[PDB]
Amino acid sequence: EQESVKEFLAKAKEEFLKKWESPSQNTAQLDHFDRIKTLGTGFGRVMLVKHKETGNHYAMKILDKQKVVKLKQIEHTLNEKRILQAVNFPFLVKLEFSFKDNSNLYMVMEYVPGGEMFSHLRRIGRFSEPHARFYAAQIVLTFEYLHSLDLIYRDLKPENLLIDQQGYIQVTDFGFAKRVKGRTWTLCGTPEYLAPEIILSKGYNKAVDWWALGVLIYEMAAGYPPFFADQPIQIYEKIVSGKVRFPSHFSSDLKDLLRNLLQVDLTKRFGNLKNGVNDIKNHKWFATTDWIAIYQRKVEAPFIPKFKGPGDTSNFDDYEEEEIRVSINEKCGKEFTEF
Ligand SMILES: Cc1ccc2c(n1)N(C)[C@H](CO)CCNC2
Ligand SMILES: Cc1ccc2c(n1)N(C)[C@H](CO)CCNC2
Ligand SMILES: Cc1ccc2c(n1)N(C)[C@H](CO)CCNC2
Ligand SMILES: Cc1ccc2c(n1)N(C)[C@H](CO)CCNC2
Numbered sequence: 001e002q003e004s005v006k007e008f009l010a011k012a013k014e015e016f017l018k019k020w021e022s023p024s025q026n027t028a029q030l031d032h033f034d035r036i037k038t039l040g041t042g043f044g045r046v047m048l049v050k051h052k053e054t055g056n057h058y059a060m061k062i063l064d065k066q067k068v069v070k071l072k073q074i075e076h077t078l079n080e081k082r083i084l085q086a087v088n089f090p091f092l093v094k095l096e097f098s099f100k101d102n103s104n105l106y107m108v109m110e111y112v113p114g115g116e117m118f119s120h121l122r123r124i125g126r127f128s129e130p131h132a133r134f135y136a137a138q139i140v141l142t143f144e145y146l147h148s149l150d151l152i153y154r155d156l157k158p159e160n161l162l163i164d165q166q167g168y169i170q171v172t173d174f175g176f177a178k179r180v181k182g183r184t185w186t187l188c189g190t191p192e193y194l195a196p197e198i199i200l201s202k203g204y205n206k207a208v209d210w211w212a213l214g215v216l217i218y219e220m221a222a223g224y225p226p227f228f229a230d231q232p233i234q235i236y237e238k239i240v241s242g243k244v245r246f247p248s249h250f251s252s253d254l255k256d257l258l259r260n261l262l263q264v265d266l267t268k269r270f271g272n273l274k275n276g277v278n279d280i281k282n283h284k285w286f287a288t289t290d291w292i293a294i295y296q297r298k299v300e301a302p303f304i305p306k307f308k309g310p311g312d313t314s315n316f317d318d319y320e321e322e323e324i325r326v327s328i329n330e331k332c333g334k335e336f337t338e339f
Helices: 005-021 065-070 074-084 117-124 129-148 207-222 232-241 252-261 291-295
Strands: 033-041 044-051 057-064 095-100 104-110 161-163 169-171
Touching: 005 129, 033 057, 057 065, 065 074, 065 104, 074 095, 074 104, 117 161, 117 207, 129 169, 129 207, 129 291, 207 252
Parallel strands: none
Antiparallel strands: 033 044, 044 057, 057 104, 095 104, 161 169
8 A cells, every 4th residue: 555654654553542442352262272392481481382273373472470470570461462462563473362261371473483583693693784674674664663653662682583484574572562651660671682771760762662773783783782791780881881882894874873773862862853763764774775665575585594384393492391280270360350
């Protein structure tokens, strides 16, 4: 559909609000699926499952209700599921089902077989600037979409970006995402990717996602993130200084974009100025990017992950296989009424 960015975002917001104000609930149950393999573990696990009637594969995120309460994650788990059931964008993973039982919360999403961007980045070492720019353009469009809905993402990093069968990104986890008008205050995220105003316990806004994009672009093009150290306290000291050194192989345009995204003063940071996302989209580093062609998935990707079929797990790693235990008695019912 050929139309302005403004009209596209206006309709996107109308559609999001309809699902936001009436969330879907209870759309499957656990014994509708066969368990295949644990894909990741950290109050929660991600497991490859297969729907018994259709044969379709899904990634099932399982959260232990007792651990969420103790780790003070209740509102974040409610945010994640409510946001995931309401969004719709080419680079966002689709939630197909959600439900809960006596012990756990379950979010059943499309399974993306290509693996995490993190794995591919670490195998190759670094991405060339055109390869990094292909991925970065998808994040810029996704953040323009999310921010226009008043959503902040708050966990951009290579482990949260999966690569699909066409070589495009799927942003998968929404565990820290939140609908925010104005400012928000929770400490969350991952140390290497935190903006200075999060570290300093300030009231912060969507500018923290544009800072995180600067960290991601740096890490994709260098092979390592710009602020790193053995301990979080030392990482935080480097972030708040904002002193950054760039590899000599970085182009001048890449360095300029990064100095404007990794701007410690949030009131001067690209993405947070009067022209908003257009200061990023119009930057010289993106001069070759065809934004419509990226959105429509018409650009050939830099590479296609190797995998054998929709159930192949070869691009994910191996974890001890543990039970999914469901109590005879219901736990934490009041806390998760809305889920
Ligand atoms: C499909 C899949 C596998 C492994 C993981 C995963 N998803 N995700 C996105 C989690 C966050 O939920 C973080 C990355 N590591 C484990
Ligand atoms: C009762 C309540 C309201 C709002 C919030 C909340 N609890 N908590 C504790 C979360 C963490 O889950 C972050 C702080 N801001 C939102
Ligand atoms: C440059 C331009 C114009 C119009 C649009 C556009 N880009 N994109 C890529 C959006 C998403 O941002 C969807 C396609 N239609 C509207
Ligand atoms: C294997 C399995 C099944 C069911 C349960 C279980 N384990 N355990 C041990 C839990 C967790 O302490 C408590 C008992 N209720 C359900």
